[PDB]
Amino acid sequence: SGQNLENIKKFIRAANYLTVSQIFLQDNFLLERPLTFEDIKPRLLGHWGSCPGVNWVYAHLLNIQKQLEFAKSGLKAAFMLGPGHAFPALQANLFMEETLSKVDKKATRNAQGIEYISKNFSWPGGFPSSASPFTPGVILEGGELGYSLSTAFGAILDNPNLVMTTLIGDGEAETGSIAAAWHLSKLIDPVKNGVVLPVLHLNGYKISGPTIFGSMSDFELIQFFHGAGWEPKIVDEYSAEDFDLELSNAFSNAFRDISRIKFGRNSKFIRLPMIIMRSKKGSSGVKENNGQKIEGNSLAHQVPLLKAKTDKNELEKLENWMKSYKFDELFDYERGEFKWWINDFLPENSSRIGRNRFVDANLNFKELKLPEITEGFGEKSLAMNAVGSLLEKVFEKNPDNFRFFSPDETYSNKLDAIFEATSRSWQREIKPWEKDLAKNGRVTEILSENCLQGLLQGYILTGRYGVLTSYEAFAPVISSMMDQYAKFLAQSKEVKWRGDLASLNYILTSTGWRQDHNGFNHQNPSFIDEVLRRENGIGQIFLPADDNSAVAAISKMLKTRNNINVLVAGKTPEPRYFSLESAQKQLENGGIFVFDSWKNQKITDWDSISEDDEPDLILAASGDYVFKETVAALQVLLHDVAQVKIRLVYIQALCGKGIGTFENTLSKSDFVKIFTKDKPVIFAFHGYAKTLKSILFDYENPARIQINGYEEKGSTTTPFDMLARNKVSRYDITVRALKSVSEGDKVFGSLVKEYRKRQDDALRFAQENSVDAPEIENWDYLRFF
Amino acid sequence: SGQNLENIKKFIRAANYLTVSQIFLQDNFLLERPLTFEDIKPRLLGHWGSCPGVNWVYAHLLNIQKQLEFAKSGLKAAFMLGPGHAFPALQANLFMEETLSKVDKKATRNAQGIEYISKNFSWPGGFPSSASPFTPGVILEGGELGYSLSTAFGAILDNPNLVMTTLIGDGEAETGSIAAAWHLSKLIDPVKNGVVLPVLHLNGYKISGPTIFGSMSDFELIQFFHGAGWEPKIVDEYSAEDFDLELSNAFSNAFRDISRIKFGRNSKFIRLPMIIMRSKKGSSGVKENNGQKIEGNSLAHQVPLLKAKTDKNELEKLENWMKSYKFDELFDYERGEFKWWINDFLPENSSRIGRNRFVDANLNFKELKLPEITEGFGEKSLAMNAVGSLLEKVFEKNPDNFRFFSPDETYSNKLDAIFEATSRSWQREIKPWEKDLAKNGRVTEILSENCLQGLLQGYILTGRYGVLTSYEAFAPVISSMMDQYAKFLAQSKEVKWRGDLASLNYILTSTGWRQDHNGFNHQNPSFIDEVLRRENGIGQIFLPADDNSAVAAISKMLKTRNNINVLVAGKTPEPRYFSLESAQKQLENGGIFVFDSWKNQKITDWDSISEDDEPDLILAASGDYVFKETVAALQVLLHDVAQVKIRLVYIQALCGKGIGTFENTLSKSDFVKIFTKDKPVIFAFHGYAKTLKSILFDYENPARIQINGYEEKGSTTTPFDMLARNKVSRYDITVRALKSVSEGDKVFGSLVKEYRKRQDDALRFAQENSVDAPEIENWDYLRFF
Ligand SMILES: Cc1ncc(C[n+]2csc(CCOP(=O)(O)OP(=O)(O)O)c2C)c(N)n1
Numbered sequence A, B: 001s002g003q004n005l006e007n008i009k010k011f012i013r014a015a016n017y018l019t020v021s022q023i024f025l026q027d028n029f030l031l032e033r034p035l036t037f038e039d040i041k042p043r044l045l046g047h048w049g050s051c052p053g054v055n056w057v058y059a060h061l062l063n064i065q066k067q068l069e070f071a072k073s074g075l076k077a078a079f080m081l082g083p084g085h086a087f088p089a090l091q092a093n094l095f096m097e098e099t100l101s102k103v104d105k106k107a108t109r110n111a112q113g114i115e116y117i118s119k120n121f122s123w124p125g126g127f128p129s130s131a132s133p134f135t136p137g138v139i140l141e142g143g144e145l146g147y148s149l150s151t152a153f154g155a156i157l158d159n160p161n162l163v164m165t166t167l168i169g170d171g172e173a174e175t176g177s178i179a180a181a182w183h184l185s186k187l188i189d190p191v192k193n194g195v196v197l198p199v200l201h202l203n204g205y206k207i208s209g210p211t212i213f214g215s216m217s218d219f220e221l222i223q224f225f226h227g228a229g230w231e232p233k234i235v236d237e238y239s240a241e242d243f244d245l246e247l248s249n250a251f252s253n254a255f256r257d258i259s260r261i262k263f264g265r266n267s268k269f270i271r272l273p274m275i276i277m278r279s280k281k282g283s284s285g286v287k288e289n290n291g292q293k294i295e296g297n298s299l300a301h302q303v304p305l306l307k308a309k310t311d312k313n314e315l316e317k318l319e320n321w322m323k324s325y326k327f328d329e330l331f332d333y334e335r336g337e338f339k340w341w342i343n344d345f346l347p348e349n350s351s352r353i354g355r356n357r358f359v360d361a362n363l364n365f366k367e368l369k370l371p372e373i374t375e376g377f378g379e380k381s382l383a384m385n386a387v388g389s390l391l392e393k394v395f396e397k398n399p400d401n402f403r404f405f406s407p408d409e410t411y412s413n414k415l416d417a418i419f420e421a422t423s424r425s426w427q428r429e430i431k432p433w434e435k436d437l438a439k440n441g442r443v444t445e446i447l448s449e450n451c452l453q454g455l456l457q458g459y460i461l462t463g464r465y466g467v468l469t470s471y472e473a474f475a476p477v478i479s480s481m482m483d484q485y486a487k488f489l490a491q492s493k494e495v496k497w498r499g500d501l502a503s504l505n506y507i508l509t510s511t512g513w514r515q516d517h518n519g520f521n522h523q524n525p526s527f528i529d530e531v532l533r534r535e536n537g538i539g540q541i542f543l544p545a546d547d548n549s550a551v552a553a554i555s556k557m558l559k560t561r562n563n564i565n566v567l568v569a570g571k572t573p574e575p576r577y578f579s580l581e582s583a584q585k586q587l588e589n590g591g592i593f594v595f596d597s598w599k600n601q602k603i604t605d606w607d608s609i610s611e612d613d614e615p616d617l618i619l620a621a622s623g624d625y626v627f628k629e630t631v632a633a634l635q636v637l638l639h640d641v642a643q644v645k646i647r648l649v650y651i652q653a654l655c656g657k658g659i660g661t662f663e664n665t666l667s668k669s670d671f672v673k674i675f676t677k678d679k680p681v682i683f684a685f686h687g688y689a690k691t692l693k694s695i696l697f698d699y700e701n702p703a704r705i706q707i708n709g710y711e712e713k714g715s716t717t718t719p720f721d722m723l724a725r726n727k728v729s730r731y732d733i734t735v736r737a738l739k740s741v742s743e744g745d746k747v748f749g750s751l752v753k754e755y756r757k758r759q760d761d762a763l764r765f766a767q768e769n770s771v772d773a774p775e776i777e778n779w780d781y782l783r784f785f
């Protein structure tokens, strides 16, 4: 180890030297001639305070891996960077090993490469300042802090030979997402899956002040993490030999992991180890500047020497800083390459940390096999039951790359049919009266919506499949996390060596239109608006009409790649309108159904519509609950006024580019064919009225379109009262249609009075009896089977 | 003490009986005649599992308050309900006092009130099923789990004599918001601000499964909660001979410790006590049904007997359950009132938990005194410095009801001028090289955006003032919590005894147009769109043009009541366009400025705008960065074309009802006057293009309006490159304008050519030199003062 210990010091010294070169230097990288004012970048950008901590961890992980390969191999280690602002330290480590040269040819480990990476850091058109899809071996960007611990647990599933080492800052540990994720070890079995190894950087400071975790003593830190289900060890820089103590720390930790993953002699809960390291922020850099305590203080976070290009005394400080690392003893200047010491340090080439086989996709991604599609039976359509039955067969046909995530809502959402094939993962004691709990369950449930999102994206980014479901009103809790993932997808489209991934799928049910045991607090359809705002061909919403439409919607979602999808439907018995055999699947090529009521003619070809025969009024809807009110309103209008020709339209899908899907998006010319150039359009929507207004802005004549939807008005009451409160009931729609057609008061004045009276009677019945009126309860609806 | 325990037991029995009555009965509440199928609600709604714990906590708190009042102490206790689905227990507890009768006259403590509260629970038009603004003494809705601990810590911020007892469920404790809030005791001094006493309801089950905290042992729980700054005590129903006796002892010891800490001394960090209560879920209810173990299991969460109105066996169980309480020994049936025992147990009417003087906003709200507006000027506008200077004086003139919250970005946002008046609160050790830390600081900083939002809304709901600032891109982290607050405001508008509250104010800066040390991750302008989505006269956005406009807007924000406000502006040196007096006039006219370039005439009154003399093109912008590009583009066109008339428009504020403020919102007729009915409009926006499209949907002729925004494209580069990447720059604005007037391409073709090569040259210079071109850097802009 004595020869090994000294070799690690050379690796850390060289990594530190290259980190400084990328931040400051524009020329004279090897320091052959004295530094001047022309060898400094015009704008200094980047961060330095946390960079020395990254260099320490990466070098010690490389030494451990070589020991593992020497005897009793099998375990492959990876690296996760939580503090994404420490990217220049990560770039240097991927350069000293030949990982970077496999993607970019100009990044060869010679004098030409040193100038290339140093000059192009943070340069316009060069490398970015933070982690991104352009860096090999990267799955977490780390921009918005707090989503590292949960993502590591998601990429560690079904990979028994992967050990993921994730670095978390002490400031980042104060986030709610990190605080909840410490209990994730109580639901995941580390024998059939891998092991997550977290490292707490604990440099003591945030941007401009101390940290909560830095103020705690040694006794407090051990007690807290030992109560969270871990085994922490503490190493601090205020000791005799930091590198010697760090070496024994990482060695003894990996020893525990091997003595636990292969013996399998434990049936109770396990205690995974973790590392807490304490160090001075910005170590080995500038100590003081104007007597202001740069090192060991929050002032080392960003660039320390701000005026190195203008101040003579700052230029000197930078030169003495870099000359502290004796780079001429590690690099051969005449040849232009490292000395022989580096090849001894990392002799094995296939299993280098930055090219891990388990973490990297394109080596594990496989197609998903879909079972046959069967119709639904009965008089009442139950959308959630049909989807739950289809997902049960998917679990059987793909026993290795499918998983399900929910915040204890699968029973409430009527999706428990998936429990005939698997259970819920649980590593603690199980009671005799408890059911559906197993150690190897493929469904993970926890009340933290952020932890569930982290596990799902860790699974998909490694090359697997998964689905997440929850209450619709509580989806916006993870709006920011979805946005960060959406930025990963758009950037990855410009990388030629990335490949393909499965899409992110959401099932949202138990909407606010039918919240019976709850009230106003559970009605918030804002998440689907957030998804539609991405503008790089990302974001699709499915709005099924019945159970037949639902099963082919989830089937289409499971076949799409590199996107984000959301499904919204109810869970209560509902009328069934369409047949699955041919009608409903044909709708999916466009996602719109058109019915011409005055001739009982269904339309599927948009070019058969004739200008000679057009409706006097168009009734439209999007959403199962608002479609039922629209069909009922058409029945009332067909009975009373026969001269008014009405065209019925339902929209099953919406995308960020317009109406329909990305594969088949409705054009502007077709929109004029369906909706006449100048005719009233009454449109009822499942969500906010402004969400649809933004989409319909780019279509023809938006002045004549009346849009109604949820308006943040409701309480605990009957389902009909909720529709009438927001003015989307059947009698609300039929009054609006009469007003729009002609004058609206010539003969329909008496009809408007009668329909208003009917609505008044129904609301009065509910108040007295707490039950919907028999006229609406036993309504006979239309069907297009 | 000997007589008190029996009174507590009687109180708990009565509360349980009333809870069951509210859940089930619609008639025969006193159980005189035998129960039949006609005395059951047609629709059973509600929850029962957590109800028994609330009764225990409330009764013991009442006993403690009476004891405290006896011993001449100034401590007043309040109650906070985390599990908002346990509302019927809280309603029963409030009814047994006179708190409910002080607000509703029909809720008197007799048989009429008993029937009134029992029948109207969850009834259409009656009381809701969850906590709401309609309940006295309520500030937290509790529909979305979490936020209770943070709101409680925000409530005790200037009330040294208020002790807030908050009840947290074990499933709720798994959320990140609750997980992060356990460290809030390291920033708040309890001696001068009050004490928070949290109770953990460890019933052991979520909706349909066990809990993370229920699986841990006593050793693990003690070690974990002692790891934070707390002193936990555990009482469990399973192994205790006298659960009520243990509960009383624990509460008495906790309050004795609170009094000793408050009134003795304070030198170092102080550990506050907390209570962990372990009990069987749904205790005292039905035990088994079809051999399924209702009690002590997750099946007791909702209504236990779903078919009591159709099953003979279920009807018997309900009758036995209710008769087990022996209500006839506590209620006088002939006089229809409680016996004398209740009057010997309750405290004096002033010292009752339901009416805590420190919680009501009506007894604490005071006006805010605004310092004189010193609209100073240097050479370049610095909006953040001007705002920070004004906020410094506000701190001095209101030394008791103003506070500031930020996630460690005070220095980064250029708002450190407020540090001449106050420091940052900190209760741990302070180092010699650290500055701006004090035990009594009025600025609280923590990286948890959820904790900061909880403290701010706890402060405002008690009747005080506060401001929150953060990064615009990371604002959407707390999007859901703002929505829950918005539901409180709309509901409380219908309550006639609520009163007035201050506004929720946000300052967002360091936008994505000038992120220099970060790239494409700190770029997300979605929070303002979420705020603009509430539809009850809530949601206002301010978009200042310079520092003079910034101070005018912040002064207006501090004077508005019962709303939510957001201000977005940059922090870099910028041109100055408007004077001290013109800016304030604009805000009182609708926040819009109009300039007629071909005549050098400014317009302030929308009447008398000549229809004969109208522009050929309208250039518009909203946002400081996009306004600079629009002014520069106007100069180029004025120089080159000089024959087409251009009108310049800037928008300073947007509301949920249209253009302007709620007090003064631009009308449809005025919109036609400013923007000509049929002329092209080129509009550049600071945020997403679809956010403005939804607002402009309701205005005149949307087909002729072109909108460009952030578009989700960028990386680490120069400021001009970022503007040009998203197609918002002076040259591409001039190209868009030239094509609009004559797209026939027979004219201005060479001009369209020339402007593109200028952009190409600028981008090439940026790529080569890492700085912007001198032609753009040294540009001379317009000014209107
Ligand atoms: C959610 C969020 N809030 C704020 C920021 C701004 N920010 C970037 S880095 C940083 C400090 C990180 O501190 P720490 O974890 O101690 O890191 P280190 O000192 O190791 O760099 C902050 C607040 C952010 N990136 N994300």
Ligand SMILES: Cc1ncc(C[n+]2csc(CCOP(=O)(O)OP(=O)(O)O)c2C)c(N)n1
Pocket: A407, A408, A447, A474, B049, B050, B083, B085, B143, B144, B145, B168, B169, B170, B171, B172, B201, B203, B205, B206, B207, B211, B281
């Ligand atoms: C953020 C959020 N996610 C999910 C829910 C759905 N929900 C309502 S109650 C509940 C379980 C509450 O469990 P707990 O508080 O531990 O139990 P109790 O005290 O009521 O017995 C859940 C998940 C919610 N209200 N909020």
